[PDB]
Amino acid sequence: NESGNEGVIINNFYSNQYQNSIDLSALSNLL
Amino acid sequence: NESGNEGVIINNFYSNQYQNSIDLSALSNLL
Amino acid sequence: SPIPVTVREHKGCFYSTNPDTTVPIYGKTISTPSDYMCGEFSDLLELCKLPTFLGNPNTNNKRYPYFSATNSVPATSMVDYQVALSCSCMANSMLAAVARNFNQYRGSLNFLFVFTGAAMVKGKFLIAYTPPGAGKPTTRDQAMQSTYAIWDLGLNSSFNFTAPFISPTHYRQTSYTSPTITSVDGWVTVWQLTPLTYPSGTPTNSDILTLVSAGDDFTLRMPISPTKWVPQ
Amino acid sequence: SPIPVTVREHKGCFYSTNPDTTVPIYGKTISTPSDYMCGEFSDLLELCKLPTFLGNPNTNNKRYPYFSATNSVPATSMVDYQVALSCSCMANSMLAAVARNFNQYRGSLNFLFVFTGAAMVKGKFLIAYTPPGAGKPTTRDQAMQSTYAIWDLGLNSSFNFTAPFISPTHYRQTSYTSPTITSVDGWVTVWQLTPLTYPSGTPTNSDILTLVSAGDDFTLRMPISPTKWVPQ
Amino acid sequence: SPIPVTVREHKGCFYSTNPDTTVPIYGKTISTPSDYMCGEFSDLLELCKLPTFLGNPNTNNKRYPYFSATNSVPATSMVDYQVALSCSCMANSMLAAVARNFNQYRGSLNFLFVFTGAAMVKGKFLIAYTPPGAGKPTTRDQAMQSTYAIWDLGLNSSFNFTAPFISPTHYRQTSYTSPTITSVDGWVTVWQLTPLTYPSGTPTNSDILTLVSAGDDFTLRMPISPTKWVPQ
Amino acid sequence: DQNTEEMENLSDRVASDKAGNSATNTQSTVGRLCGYGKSHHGEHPASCADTATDKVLAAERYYTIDLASWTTSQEAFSHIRIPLPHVLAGEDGGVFGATLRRHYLCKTGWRVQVQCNASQFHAGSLLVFMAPEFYTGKGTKTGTMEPSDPFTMDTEWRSPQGAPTGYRYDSRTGFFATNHQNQWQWTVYPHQILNLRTNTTVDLEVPYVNVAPSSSWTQHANWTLVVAVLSPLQYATGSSPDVQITASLQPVNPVFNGLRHETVIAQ
């Protein structure tokens, strides 16, 4: 079940990338 | 990936033609 | 074309615990990974189920951790701590420390007792949970008629007890003692059922170590935030 | 019929970096084409990967571009510039100039050295990156135990070096020197491993030209905006 | 249930050229038809492509409509009006009058010349557009090296000329003469290449009638609204 | 890296370019930068209705002339600028220049070759790079505000000033100006080095980029060429000080349009 205190049916307008934090895993000059 | 700082899920109401700049490529009288 | 909207009464209110986002400012920003850091606990409960240590007092008010016993007769014994998940005992303990940043609790509690005495020793303890109705027992005899377990001190160092939830209400208040109201409930007592025996060359006296926990039944719900302290 | 709306707390705020449009005024307006103008760079990184020139000082504080060398023994040599992408050196450089309008950096750096001396000449340089832990080397000997490359001055005019990213943190701060804090790291040194030799009829003295760049590994993220200047 | 809304910064602004409706008041109201009224023009361009009349001056400042000529030698002739779609000439003209309530123009222009002289007459005119670079010609000879057409006065009353668009910029400014800036361009001249001849019984003197238009190439874009006047 | 080779200057280092009725040779090349990555297609200006004067052999050749003298004396980042079109502009610019000022507009790209040959007992390094919007001038104007001679070909060298604030101009001071340059980044421009050691020559070709597909050569100069030095000329007592620097250029596929009657002025 859902995120935490965060519960509207319309979820996020912006873009995840935009509301929280991406989140991740570890031309020419010519001659 | 998307325009730049511009990230809502609802994109543009108006009409592109109307929010930024088109963008482009180079009756009678009778007798 | 504009959509007519009826502005509602609140209109410039800020709700603290308001379940819904707000506006960003710094976007398309990638976070420094983790990856390599084991030990992430998602739920708190999974915490308050690790004994931490109930401090037992002596004149200096220097509570210390042990129920401590010998050679013979109690008293009305050995100890007595109630089960009022706000006690003097359980507070400072994780479970009790966690149980607090929450309004209600349900489920069965568990008290674990580890003996620290000499291996050439031998003792036998009676243990019990006595529900509210009548009064705090004043003699083993009076105690035994409650949920208990005779602990035989042997090889096997520790005993596991667990005081149920004998509650009308499906839930109980995590404790805020604007008085003692009806809801809260419990006393756990313990006394020797045979003295703690020992041959020559070994100690009279011995200390046994205290550690509360919340079973496979424990549930805390209603976050809140207590009582501003600033210790000592 | 009006849709009720709950007006949120902010309600008349303007966010500077707010990711979302606003209202037009002049529409259905067609822009003057381009078409014929080659040379459009989409990403900045693809910039800060073009050496520009690290200015090397001499008494007048008239830094100038060359590491400059001869006939024999250093010293503790030839130079030394640290790798603190905010240095004295790298600033003014593209990479360093671009790296700044950004909060963090990661990846491997590259230092390129082009010799300018006479073709009838000959020299041999040792080069190294020495990570923070101990101190700044004070002798080649002390240096060599670091990532380096013996440069043989020949036909082939320039050498390409590249100081890694030996970093705990997956990222580092692009540099704002409210002091030197722990994060930042690097010193690159260079000394001759054999003197710079030359027959009769040619110069003692020779200058060799400096140019920083950000490899195939360089990453800047978190836009910001530094430090108000107004040059000279 | 109310939908939370973030009110944006503007919040009580009125945009003049705002592309979007507003609220009615009198609805389900049917309009008096048309049906029977021919002559509806949808686009303006389709207007400014109908010559109207460029007024040619004489001492009284009583400009009047004719380029007017005879028996022999100009001068530096006959006329000269530049092509600066804001001139003295073209303003008052439709195209020029329409071209104005617009910020930019592109495409080819057309100048039409109708002869009004006696049918027993005969003349021959050279005509040219001379782009900016050097100066305004000061002799036919100097003119001819430009786009032109030798007009033979015959049966066929009128000639059609058209001065291109020899422009760097894909577009030009419709004219607002906070000075003469670089963009604007053109002069059109005209002189006789043989005099205007005539037998006995006919007039020396003859007037020929002026009428600007915007070709099959003319484009005006960026509405605006000029320069408050209140004539005479 | 490049073919096997030297005291003498050899093989995959010998290049030749023929254009029109002028043909070049170098026996000690290191390349030829086609700056940006595209050349110039005789793409007709879309701007004009002028079906212009195209593919003329006669102008599409290599005009050669002397820029200046390089010598032991000069200091780093001292510089020498060559604006194009305005130097191939007339007399010295063949049929190109003529047809150049008989026309309102041009659109071309340049193929340049600067030469400076020395000797293996010589040290130094010459930086050659083409930049469009840049600066010329050759002056702080007379008595009335704004700014001395862009069309002139820097007769002598100018002094790297301990600071851009790009030679602002009306008696003033405090702060910088839009003609800045960081001769310290002056290696983001299509360039090429000339290392007496490595190099005797340097070839650069650059496409068309102004603000308009064709521009007017009487008020603009879309590209200025810069032969300014980054590690001076030491010479050991024996040896040829006189380091004569020569430049030879070629307009590539110019497209002229908008014709009229010989432009008139140059002081």
- D36 touching F (Cβ < 8 Å): yes
| Closest alpha carbon to F183 in F29, F79, F38 | F79
D141, amino acid identity: D
Judged by CB atoms closer than 8 Å, whether chains meet at A23 and C27 is answered as: no
What resolution (Å)? 3.5
Contact C193, C126 (CB under 8 A): yes
Judged by CB atoms closer than 8 Å, whether chains meet at D9 and C14 is answered as: yes
Contact E41, E201 (CB under 8 A): no
Q: How long a stretch of residues is chain F?
A: 267
Using a CB-CB distance cutoff of 8 angstroms, which residues of chain E are in contact with residue F49?
Answer: 108, 164-166, 217
Using a CB-CB distance cutoff of 8 angstroms, which residues of chain D are in contact with residue C19?
Answer: none
Bridge-partner residues for E211, per DSSP?
Answer: E112
CA distance E158 to chain F (A): 24
User: Mutation test of the interface with chain F: which of E141, E142, E167, E187, choosing the one with the most F Cβ atoms within 10 A?
Assistant: E167
Judged by CB atoms closer than 8 Å, whether chains meet at D19 and A18 is answered as: yes
* Topology of the domain covering F1-267: Jelly Rolls (2.60.120)
Bridge-partner residues for C213, per DSSP?
Answer: C110
Distance between CA atoms of residues D143 and F13, nearest Å = 39
> Biggest alpha carbon distance in chain B?
59
N- to C-terminal Cα distance for chain A? Answer: 58
The domain limits of chain F are 1-267
DSSP symbols for E85-139: TTSSSSBTBHHHHTSSSEEEEES--EEEEEE-S-TT-EEEEEEEE--BTB---SS
Burial class of residue F171 (count of CB atoms within 10 Å of its CB; 0-12, 13-18, 19+): exposed
Per-residue CA distances from D99 to D160, E155, E174 (Å): 21, 77, 45
DSSP symbols for chain E: --EEE---S--S---TT-SS----SS-S-PPPP--S-------STTTTTS-----B--SSS--BS---B-SS--SS-SEEE---TTSSSSBTBHHHHTSSSEEEEES--EEEEEE-S-TT-EEEEEEEE--BTB---SSHHHHTTSEE--EE-SSS-EEEE------SSSSEE----SS--SS----EEEEEEEEEE--TTS-S-B-EEEEEE--SS-EEEEE---------
Distance between CA atoms of residues F118 and F70, nearest Å = 11
E33, amino acid identity: P
Judged by CB atoms closer than 8 Å, whether chains meet at B6 and D21 is answered as: yes
CA distance D44 to chain B (A): 14
Tokens of D37: 């103008």
Distance between CA atoms of residues C193 and C152, nearest Å = 10
Judged by CB atoms closer than 8 Å, whether chains meet at D209 and F230 is answered as: yes
Helices (H), C30-114: 94-97
| Closest alpha carbon to D84 in D159, D6, D179 | D179
User: Mutation test of the interface with chain D: which of C1, C7, C36, choosing the one with the most D Cβ atoms within 10 A?
Assistant: C7
Antiparallel, parallel or unpaired: β D122-129 and D3-7: unpaired
Burial class of residue F123 (count of CB atoms within 10 Å of its CB; 0-12, 13-18, 19+): buried
Distance between CA atoms of residues C60 and C83, nearest Å = 24
- A30 touching F (Cβ < 8 Å): yes
**By a Cβ cutoff of 8 Å, what residues of chain F touch chain E?**
46-50, 101-105, 210, 212-216, 218-219, 257-264
Using a CB-CB distance cutoff of 8 angstroms, which residues of chain A are in contact with residue D19?
Answer: 14-15, 18
Q: Which residues of A1-31 are buried (b: 16+ CB within 10 A; e: fewer)?
A: eeeeeeeeeeeeebbebbbeeeeeeeeebee
Judged by CB atoms closer than 8 Å, whether chains meet at B18 and E19 is answered as: yes
Judged by CB atoms closer than 8 Å, whether chains meet at D26 and E170 is answered as: no
Distance between CA atoms of residues F207 and F37, nearest Å = 9
User: What strands lie across the sheet with F201-206, from one edge to the other?
Assistant: F33-34, F201-206, F109-115, F243-252, F63-70
Distance between CA atoms of residues C10 and D52, nearest Å = 59
Which residues lie below 8 Å from residue C162, measured CB to CB, with a gap of 6+? C108, C109, C110, C111, C215
Distance between CA atoms of residues C95 and C52, nearest Å = 8
Judged by CB atoms closer than 8 Å, whether chains meet at A18 and C30 is answered as: no
CA distance C1 to chain E (A): 5
Which residues lie below 8 Å from residue F158, measured CB to CB, with a gap of 6+? F78, F79, F80
Judged by CB atoms closer than 8 Å, whether chains meet at F184 and D55 is answered as: yes
DSSP symbols for chain F: --SS--SS--GGG-EEEEETTEEEEESS----EESSS--------SS-S---B---GGGSS-EEEEEEEE-TTPPTTBB-EEEESTTTSSSTTHHHHHHHSSEEEE--EEEEEEE----TT---EEEEEEESS----S---SSSSS-S-BTB--SS-BPPPS--STT--SS--SS--TT---TTTTTSSSEEEE-TTT-SEEEEEE---SSSSSEETTT--SEEEEEEEEE-----TTS---EEEEEEEEEES--BEEE-S------
Whether CATH 2.60.120.20 fits D1-232: yes
Distance between CA atoms of residues C135 and F49, nearest Å = 110
Distance between CA atoms of residues D26 and B16, nearest Å = 12
Distance between CA atoms of residues F162 and C221, nearest Å = 71
CA distance C27 to chain D (A): 7
Judged by CB atoms closer than 8 Å, whether chains meet at E5 and C8 is answered as: no
Per-residue CA distances from C148 to C161, C164, E11 (Å): 8, 11, 70
- D197 touching F (Cβ < 8 Å): no
Tokens of E88: 């003295």
The domain limits of chain C are 1-232
CA dihedral C24, C29, C32, C33 (to 10 degrees): 90
Contact D69, D123 (CB under 8 A): yes
Contact D113, D158 (CB under 8 A): yes
Between vectors from CA F89 to CA F84 and to CA F93, what angle results, nearest 5°?
A: 100
Judged by CB atoms closer than 8 Å, whether chains meet at A29 and F32 is answered as: no
Chains B and C touch (3+ CB pairs under 8 A): yes
CA distance E151 to chain F (A): 20
Using a CB-CB distance cutoff of 8 angstroms, which residues of chain E are in contact with residue D25?
Answer: 15-18
Contact E16, D25 (CB under 8 A): yes
Judged by CB atoms closer than 8 Å, whether chains meet at C23 and E4 is answered as: no
Judged by CB atoms closer than 8 Å, whether chains meet at E182 and F49 is answered as: no
| Closest alpha carbon to E124 in E74, E187, E52, E58 | E74
Using a CB-CB distance cutoff of 8 angstroms, which residues of chain E are in contact with residue B26?
Answer: 170
Residue C197: CA count within 13 A, CB half-sphere: 8
**By a Cβ cutoff of 8 Å, what residues of chain C touch chain E?**
1-2, 5, 8, 20, 23
Judged by CB atoms closer than 8 Å, whether chains meet at C3 and D3 is answered as: yes
Tokens of C173: 């208040």
Contact F110, F249 (CB under 8 A): yes
Tokens of C167: 């509650």
Task: Name the 3-class secondary structure at C36.
Answer: coil
| Closest alpha carbon to F163 in F183, F143, F178, F148 | F183
Contact E195, E34 (CB under 8 A): no
Task: Name the 3-class secondary structure at C94.
Answer: helix
- Restricting to E residues 54-113, those with a Cβ less than 8 Å away from any Cβ of F are 108
